Amino acid sequence: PQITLWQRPLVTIKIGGQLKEALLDTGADDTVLEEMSLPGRWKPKMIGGIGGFIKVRQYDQILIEICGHKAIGTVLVGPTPVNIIGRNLLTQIGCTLNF
Amino acid sequence: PQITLWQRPLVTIKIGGQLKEALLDTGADDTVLEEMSLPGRWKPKMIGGIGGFIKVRQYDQILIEICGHKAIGTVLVGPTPVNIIGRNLLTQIGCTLNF
Ligand SMILES: O=C(N[C@H]1c2ccccc2C[C@H]1O)[C@H](OCc1cccc(F)c1F)[C@H](O)[C@@H](O)[C@@H](OCc1cccc(F)c1F)C(=O)N[C@H]1c2ccccc2C[C@H]1O
């Protein structure tokens, strides 16, 4: 589909059998979701945004469906203000910017 | 053009007669550039992202050229780690997300 940007590019994602709303963010290198429970072991990671850095938990090879498109990749979990689908997963679903 | 997301979507912008590198950021509501001098009056504003909020100066009716495309809109100036072209200007150049 083609998504305009007059409003936030929010889409529904499915992870851990649950539906959540997330933002398609080309400005995010990685994907970070609000505090939640994921399986497996996690590794520590620091991600910096416009206001500074936050510590997040890194989970690898996580199944996540974005707008019906299945992706399997690294998902970060931490005190993010909103669920963010970053470039690591945007590339998996073949998302591009056009103008 | 069509921009893939394997790497950060950085483009050259022209503003205030200066050429700068900026990120096409669909996750950013507004456009914020690193400290610089702009004409006209400004209003203080607080913007929040990952890590928290930063104080920026809000300038309105600013003309910017993004990849040859002229756009007009509000531009925020402050301690942002990277120049960000947000939705307020991305819409003006007809930028969309496609997959
Ligand atoms: O932090 C980023 N990437 C980082 C990231 C994100 C997730 C995972 C990994 C990494 C690493 C890096 O790429 C991106 O910034 C460019 C950026 C790029 C590289 C290094 C940086 F330092 C950096 F700032 C990101 O797209 C932010 O722009 C955006 O985050 C999602 C978000 C959305 C809505 C409300 C929020 F509160 C919020 F957070 C955000 O903060 N949006 C806010 C914003 C921005 C400009 C003007 C106004 C407003 C208000 C709101 O829309």
Side-chain angles (χ1 to χ4, degrees):
Chain A
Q2 172 171 291
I3 301 176
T4 52
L5 303 168
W6 302 97
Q7 62 189 300
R8 287 187 177 178
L10 296 178
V11 297
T12 295
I13 61 165
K14 184 182 181 178
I15 183 169
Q18 295 183 300
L19 297 184
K20 295 175 175 294
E21 287 209 308
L23 184 63
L24 298 186
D25 192 349
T26 56
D29 299 325
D30 311 303
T31 294
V32 185
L33 303 177
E34 290 164 31
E35 193 53 56
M36 71 174 287
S37 181
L38 289 181
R41 290 177 61 78
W42 57 276
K43 293 176 179 179
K45 186 169 187 177
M46 291 287 280
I47 53 175
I50 200 173
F53 299 67
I54 62 173
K55 299 187 66 61
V56 293
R57 307 200 301 287
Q58 178 181 316
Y59 293 84
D60 298 310
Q61 217 166 307
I62 296 300
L63 177 61
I64 177 173
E65 188 177 300
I66 305 167
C67 281
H69 292 62
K70 289 191 174 188
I72 303 178
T74 297
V75 173
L76 307 177
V77 179
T80 175
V82 295
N83 292 317
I84 299 165
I85 301 303
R87 293 189 299 100
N88 72 304
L89 295 186
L90 292 178
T91 49
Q92 279 196 34
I93 60 175
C95 187
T96 62
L97 278 173
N98 299 272
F99 66 81
Chain B
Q2 180 172 66
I3 305 177
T4 52
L5 299 171
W6 299 111
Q7 297 83 51
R8 291 186 172 177
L10 293 174
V11 299
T12 296
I13 65 172
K14 182 178 178 61
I15 176 177
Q18 297 176 58
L19 287 180
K20 291 178 174 295
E21 185 172 64
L23 182 65
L24 299 183
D25 193 344
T26 60
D29 298 323
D30 308 302
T31 290
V32 59
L33 303 179
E34 66 200 320
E35 277 301 327
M36 68 177 288
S37 181
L38 283 183
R41 193 190 71 181
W42 52 274
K43 298 173 56 182
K45 183 176 184 177
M46 215 70 84
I47 53 180
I50 286 85
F53 295 70
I54 53 169
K55 181 179 177 180
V56 297
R57 292 182 299 166
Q58 177 186 318
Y59 290 84
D60 299 308
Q61 262 83 296
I62 299 298
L63 170 59
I64 295 186
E65 289 184 51
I66 306 173
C67 293
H69 296 66
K70 297 181 183 58
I72 304 170
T74 293
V75 171
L76 310 175
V77 179
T80 179
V82 61
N83 291 314
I84 299 168
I85 296 306
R87 293 191 300 98
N88 75 302
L89 293 183
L90 290 176
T91 55
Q92 302 304 102
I93 64 171
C95 182
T96 62
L97 285 53
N98 305 73
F99 60 102

PDB file of all heavy atoms in Angstrom, chain A residues 74-98:
ATOM      1  N   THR A  74      15.248  -8.514  14.764  1.00  0.00           N
ATOM      2  CA  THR A  74      15.574  -7.993  16.072  1.00  0.00           C
ATOM      3  C   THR A  74      14.559  -6.966  16.514  1.00  0.00           C
ATOM      4  O   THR A  74      14.203  -6.056  15.766  1.00  0.00           O
ATOM      5  CB  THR A  74      16.970  -7.366  16.069  1.00  0.00           C
ATOM      6  OG1 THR A  74      17.932  -8.386  15.776  1.00  0.00           O
ATOM      7  CG2 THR A  74      17.284  -6.736  17.428  1.00  0.00           C
ATOM      8  N   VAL A  75      14.079  -7.136  17.737  1.00  0.00           N
ATOM      9  CA  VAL A  75      13.111  -6.225  18.303  1.00  0.00           C
ATOM     10  C   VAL A  75      13.639  -5.768  19.646  1.00  0.00           C
ATOM     11  O   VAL A  75      14.083  -6.577  20.466  1.00  0.00           O
ATOM     12  CB  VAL A  75      11.745  -6.906  18.509  1.00  0.00           C
ATOM     13  CG1 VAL A  75      10.805  -5.972  19.260  1.00  0.00           C
ATOM     14  CG2 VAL A  75      11.141  -7.273  17.161  1.00  0.00           C
ATOM     15  N   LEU A  76      13.605  -4.461  19.863  1.00  0.00           N
ATOM     16  CA  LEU A  76      14.068  -3.903  21.120  1.00  0.00           C
ATOM     17  C   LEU A  76      12.848  -3.594  21.974  1.00  0.00           C
ATOM     18  O   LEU A  76      11.781  -3.262  21.456  1.00  0.00           O
ATOM     19  CB  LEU A  76      14.866  -2.628  20.865  1.00  0.00           C
ATOM     20  CG  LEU A  76      16.013  -2.774  19.864  1.00  0.00           C
ATOM     21  CD1 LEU A  76      16.674  -1.418  19.651  1.00  0.00           C
ATOM     22  CD2 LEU A  76      17.024  -3.801  20.377  1.00  0.00           C
ATOM     23  N   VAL A  77      13.007  -3.721  23.284  1.00  0.00           N
ATOM     24  CA  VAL A  77      11.913  -3.446  24.202  1.00  0.00           C
ATOM     25  C   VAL A  77      12.442  -2.516  25.271  1.00  0.00           C
ATOM     26  O   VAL A  77      13.494  -2.763  25.861  1.00  0.00           O
ATOM     27  CB  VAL A  77      11.390  -4.733  24.879  1.00  0.00           C
ATOM     28  CG1 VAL A  77      10.270  -4.386  25.856  1.00  0.00           C
ATOM     29  CG2 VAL A  77      10.882  -5.706  23.820  1.00  0.00           C
ATOM     30  N   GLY A  78      11.715  -1.437  25.514  1.00  0.00           N
ATOM     31  CA  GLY A  78      12.156  -0.494  26.516  1.00  0.00           C
ATOM     32  C   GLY A  78      11.186   0.647  26.685  1.00  0.00           C
ATOM     33  O   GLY A  78      10.086   0.637  26.115  1.00  0.00           O
ATOM     34  N   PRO A  79      11.581   1.664  27.458  1.00  0.00           N
ATOM     35  CA  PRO A  79      10.750   2.837  27.723  1.00  0.00           C
ATOM     36  C   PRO A  79      10.598   3.791  26.547  1.00  0.00           C
ATOM     37  O   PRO A  79      10.838   4.990  26.678  1.00  0.00           O
ATOM     38  CB  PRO A  79      11.456   3.484  28.909  1.00  0.00           C
ATOM     39  CG  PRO A  79      12.890   3.213  28.611  1.00  0.00           C
ATOM     40  CD  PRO A  79      12.870   1.765  28.170  1.00  0.00           C
ATOM     41  N   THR A  80      10.205   3.263  25.394  1.00  0.00           N
ATOM     42  CA  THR A  80      10.002   4.118  24.233  1.00  0.00           C
ATOM     43  C   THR A  80       8.621   4.757  24.361  1.00  0.00           C
ATOM     44  O   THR A  80       7.692   4.131  24.863  1.00  0.00           O
ATOM     45  CB  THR A  80      10.058   3.322  22.922  1.00  0.00           C
ATOM     46  OG1 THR A  80       9.742   4.194  21.829  1.00  0.00           O
ATOM     47  CG2 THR A  80       9.078   2.159  22.962  1.00  0.00           C
ATOM     48  N   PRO A  81       8.469   6.013  23.910  1.00  0.00           N
ATOM     49  CA  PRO A  81       7.179   6.712  23.992  1.00  0.00           C
ATOM     50  C   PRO A  81       6.081   6.078  23.146  1.00  0.00           C
ATOM     51  O   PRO A  81       4.894   6.198  23.462  1.00  0.00           O
ATOM     52  CB  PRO A  81       7.514   8.122  23.507  1.00  0.00           C
ATOM     53  CG  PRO A  81       8.961   8.276  23.850  1.00  0.00           C
ATOM     54  CD  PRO A  81       9.528   6.929  23.457  1.00  0.00           C
ATOM     55  N   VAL A  82       6.481   5.418  22.062  1.00  0.00           N
ATOM     56  CA  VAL A  82       5.537   4.768  21.161  1.00  0.00           C
ATOM     57  C   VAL A  82       6.214   3.570  20.518  1.00  0.00           C
ATOM     58  O   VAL A  82       7.443   3.485  20.500  1.00  0.00           O
ATOM     59  CB  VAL A  82       5.091   5.714  20.019  1.00  0.00           C
ATOM     60  CG1 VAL A  82       4.304   6.890  20.578  1.00  0.00           C
ATOM     61  CG2 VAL A  82       6.312   6.210  19.261  1.00  0.00           C
ATOM     62  N   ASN A  83       5.418   2.645  19.989  1.00  0.00           N
ATOM     63  CA  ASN A  83       5.988   1.478  19.332  1.00  0.00           C
ATOM     64  C   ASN A  83       6.544   1.949  17.999  1.00  0.00           C
ATOM     65  O   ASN A  83       5.847   2.595  17.225  1.00  0.00           O
ATOM     66  CB  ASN A  83       4.924   0.406  19.118  1.00  0.00           C
ATOM     67  CG  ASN A  83       4.447  -0.194  20.419  1.00  0.00           C
ATOM     68  OD1 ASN A  83       5.247  -0.484  21.303  1.00  0.00           O
ATOM     69  ND2 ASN A  83       3.139  -0.392  20.542  1.00  0.00           N
ATOM     70  N   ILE A  84       7.804   1.617  17.740  1.00  0.00           N
ATOM     71  CA  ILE A  84       8.471   2.052  16.519  1.00  0.00           C
ATOM     72  C   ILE A  84       8.974   0.909  15.648  1.00  0.00           C
ATOM     73  O   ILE A  84       9.698   0.038  16.115  1.00  0.00           O
ATOM     74  CB  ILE A  84       9.696   2.932  16.860  1.00  0.00           C
ATOM     75  CG1 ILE A  84       9.248   4.178  17.623  1.00  0.00           C
ATOM     76  CG2 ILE A  84      10.454   3.301  15.586  1.00  0.00           C
ATOM     77  CD1 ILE A  84      10.391   4.897  18.309  1.00  0.00           C
ATOM     78  N   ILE A  85       8.577   0.919  14.381  1.00  0.00           N
ATOM     79  CA  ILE A  85       9.057  -0.083  13.445  1.00  0.00           C
ATOM     80  C   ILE A  85      10.155   0.655  12.698  1.00  0.00           C
ATOM     81  O   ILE A  85       9.882   1.609  11.961  1.00  0.00           O
ATOM     82  CB  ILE A  85       7.971  -0.523  12.455  1.00  0.00           C
ATOM     83  CG1 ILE A  85       6.775  -1.103  13.217  1.00  0.00           C
ATOM     84  CG2 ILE A  85       8.543  -1.558  11.497  1.00  0.00           C
ATOM     85  CD1 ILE A  85       7.122  -2.264  14.122  1.00  0.00           C
ATOM     86  N   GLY A  86      11.394   0.231  12.917  1.00  0.00           N
ATOM     87  CA  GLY A  86      12.529   0.879  12.288  1.00  0.00           C
ATOM     88  C   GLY A  86      12.969   0.273  10.974  1.00  0.00           C
ATOM     89  O   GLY A  86      12.354  -0.657  10.454  1.00  0.00           O
ATOM     90  N   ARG A  87      14.060   0.800  10.436  1.00  0.00           N
ATOM     91  CA  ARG A  87      14.565   0.335   9.156  1.00  0.00           C
ATOM     92  C   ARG A  87      14.904  -1.145   9.091  1.00  0.00           C
ATOM     93  O   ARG A  87      14.777  -1.756   8.031  1.00  0.00           O
ATOM     94  CB  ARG A  87      15.780   1.170   8.743  1.00  0.00           C
ATOM     95  CG  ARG A  87      15.420   2.614   8.436  1.00  0.00           C
ATOM     96  CD  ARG A  87      16.586   3.383   7.807  1.00  0.00           C
ATOM     97  NE  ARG A  87      17.744   3.441   8.694  1.00  0.00           N
ATOM     98  CZ  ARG A  87      18.814   2.658   8.584  1.00  0.00           C
ATOM     99  NH1 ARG A  87      18.883   1.754   7.616  1.00  0.00           N
ATOM    100  NH2 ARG A  87      19.809   2.771   9.454  1.00  0.00           N
ATOM    101  N   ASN A  88      15.312  -1.737  10.208  1.00  0.00           N
ATOM    102  CA  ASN A  88      15.665  -3.150  10.176  1.00  0.00           C
ATOM    103  C   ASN A  88      14.485  -4.001   9.716  1.00  0.00           C
ATOM    104  O   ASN A  88      14.669  -4.992   9.011  1.00  0.00           O
ATOM    105  CB  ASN A  88      16.175  -3.624  11.545  1.00  0.00           C
ATOM    106  CG  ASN A  88      15.075  -3.719  12.582  1.00  0.00           C
ATOM    107  OD1 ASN A  88      14.370  -2.749  12.847  1.00  0.00           O
ATOM    108  ND2 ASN A  88      14.925  -4.899  13.176  1.00  0.00           N
ATOM    109  N   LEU A  89      13.271  -3.614  10.096  1.00  0.00           N
ATOM    110  CA  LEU A  89      12.092  -4.371   9.685  1.00  0.00           C
ATOM    111  C   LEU A  89      11.423  -3.760   8.458  1.00  0.00           C
ATOM    112  O   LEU A  89      10.802  -4.464   7.666  1.00  0.00           O
ATOM    113  CB  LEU A  89      11.086  -4.473  10.837  1.00  0.00           C
ATOM    114  CG  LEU A  89      11.582  -5.269  12.050  1.00  0.00           C
ATOM    115  CD1 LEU A  89      10.451  -5.431  13.055  1.00  0.00           C
ATOM    116  CD2 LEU A  89      12.088  -6.632  11.601  1.00  0.00           C
ATOM    117  N   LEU A  90      11.542  -2.448   8.300  1.00  0.00           N
ATOM    118  CA  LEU A  90      10.962  -1.795   7.140  1.00  0.00           C
ATOM    119  C   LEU A  90      11.575  -2.390   5.870  1.00  0.00           C
ATOM    120  O   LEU A  90      10.887  -2.561   4.860  1.00  0.00           O
ATOM    121  CB  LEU A  90      11.221  -0.287   7.196  1.00  0.00           C
ATOM    122  CG  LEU A  90      10.476   0.439   8.319  1.00  0.00           C
ATOM    123  CD1 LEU A  90      10.847   1.910   8.322  1.00  0.00           C
ATOM    124  CD2 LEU A  90       8.977   0.260   8.120  1.00  0.00           C
ATOM    125  N   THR A  91      12.867  -2.707   5.918  1.00  0.00           N
ATOM    126  CA  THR A  91      13.524  -3.290   4.752  1.00  0.00           C
ATOM    127  C   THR A  91      12.993  -4.691   4.483  1.00  0.00           C
ATOM    128  O   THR A  91      12.898  -5.112   3.330  1.00  0.00           O
ATOM    129  CB  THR A  91      15.055  -3.374   4.927  1.00  0.00           C
ATOM    130  OG1 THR A  91      15.363  -3.965   6.194  1.00  0.00           O
ATOM    131  CG2 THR A  91      15.681  -1.988   4.833  1.00  0.00           C
ATOM    132  N   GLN A  92      12.644  -5.416   5.542  1.00  0.00           N
ATOM    133  CA  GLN A  92      12.118  -6.767   5.374  1.00  0.00           C
ATOM    134  C   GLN A  92      10.772  -6.787   4.666  1.00  0.00           C
ATOM    135  O   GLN A  92      10.467  -7.730   3.941  1.00  0.00           O
ATOM    136  CB  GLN A  92      11.987  -7.480   6.724  1.00  0.00           C
ATOM    137  CG  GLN A  92      13.282  -8.060   7.228  1.00  0.00           C
ATOM    138  CD  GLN A  92      13.067  -9.070   8.328  1.00  0.00           C
ATOM    139  OE1 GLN A  92      12.067  -9.797   8.332  1.00  0.00           O
ATOM    140  NE2 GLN A  92      14.011  -9.142   9.256  1.00  0.00           N
ATOM    141  N   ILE A  93       9.957  -5.758   4.877  1.00  0.00           N
ATOM    142  CA  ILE A  93       8.659  -5.726   4.225  1.00  0.00           C
ATOM    143  C   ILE A  93       8.715  -4.990   2.891  1.00  0.00           C
ATOM    144  O   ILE A  93       7.689  -4.778   2.251  1.00  0.00           O
ATOM    145  CB  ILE A  93       7.582  -5.094   5.128  1.00  0.00           C
ATOM    146  CG1 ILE A  93       7.957  -3.655   5.477  1.00  0.00           C
ATOM    147  CG2 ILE A  93       7.417  -5.928   6.389  1.00  0.00           C
ATOM    148  CD1 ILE A  93       6.883  -2.941   6.271  1.00  0.00           C
ATOM    149  N   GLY A  94       9.921  -4.611   2.474  1.00  0.00           N
ATOM    150  CA  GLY A  94      10.097  -3.930   1.200  1.00  0.00           C
ATOM    151  C   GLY A  94       9.598  -2.499   1.158  1.00  0.00           C
ATOM    152  O   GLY A  94       9.190  -2.001   0.108  1.00  0.00           O
ATOM    153  N   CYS A  95       9.644  -1.828   2.301  1.00  0.00           N
ATOM    154  CA  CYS A  95       9.183  -0.451   2.386  1.00  0.00           C
ATOM    155  C   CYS A  95      10.197   0.541   1.827  1.00  0.00           C
ATOM    156  O   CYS A  95      11.395   0.458   2.109  1.00  0.00           O
ATOM    157  CB  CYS A  95       8.870  -0.108   3.846  1.00  0.00           C
ATOM    158  SG  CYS A  95       8.093   1.487   4.067  1.00  0.00           S
ATOM    159  N   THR A  96       9.716   1.479   1.016  1.00  0.00           N
ATOM    160  CA  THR A  96      10.586   2.500   0.453  1.00  0.00           C
ATOM    161  C   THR A  96       9.909   3.855   0.570  1.00  0.00           C
ATOM    162  O   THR A  96       8.695   3.940   0.755  1.00  0.00           O
ATOM    163  CB  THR A  96      10.890   2.263  -1.048  1.00  0.00           C
ATOM    164  OG1 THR A  96       9.671   2.309  -1.798  1.00  0.00           O
ATOM    165  CG2 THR A  96      11.566   0.913  -1.253  1.00  0.00           C
ATOM    166  N   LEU A  97      10.713   4.908   0.481  1.00  0.00           N
ATOM    167  CA  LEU A  97      10.210   6.273   0.523  1.00  0.00           C
ATOM    168  C   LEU A  97      10.155   6.707  -0.930  1.00  0.00           C
ATOM    169  O   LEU A  97      11.092   6.452  -1.685  1.00  0.00           O
ATOM    170  CB  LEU A  97      11.167   7.181   1.289  1.00  0.00           C
ATOM    171  CG  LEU A  97      11.052   7.153   2.807  1.00  0.00           C
ATOM    172  CD1 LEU A  97      12.176   7.969   3.409  1.00  0.00           C
ATOM    173  CD2 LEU A  97       9.695   7.708   3.217  1.00  0.00           C
ATOM    174  N   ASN A  98       9.066   7.363  -1.316  1.00  0.00           N
ATOM    175  CA  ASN A  98       8.892   7.798  -2.697  1.00  0.00           C
ATOM    176  C   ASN A  98       8.351   9.216  -2.825  1.00  0.00           C
ATOM    177  O   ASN A  98       7.511   9.646  -2.035  1.00  0.00           O
ATOM    178  CB  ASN A  98       7.935   6.842  -3.410  1.00  0.00           C
ATOM    179  CG  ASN A  98       8.458   5.426  -3.454  1.00  0.00           C
ATOM    180  OD1 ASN A  98       9.189   5.052  -4.372  1.00  0.00           O
ATOM    181  ND2 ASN A  98       8.103   4.632  -2.451  1.00  0.00           N
TER     182      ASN A  98
END
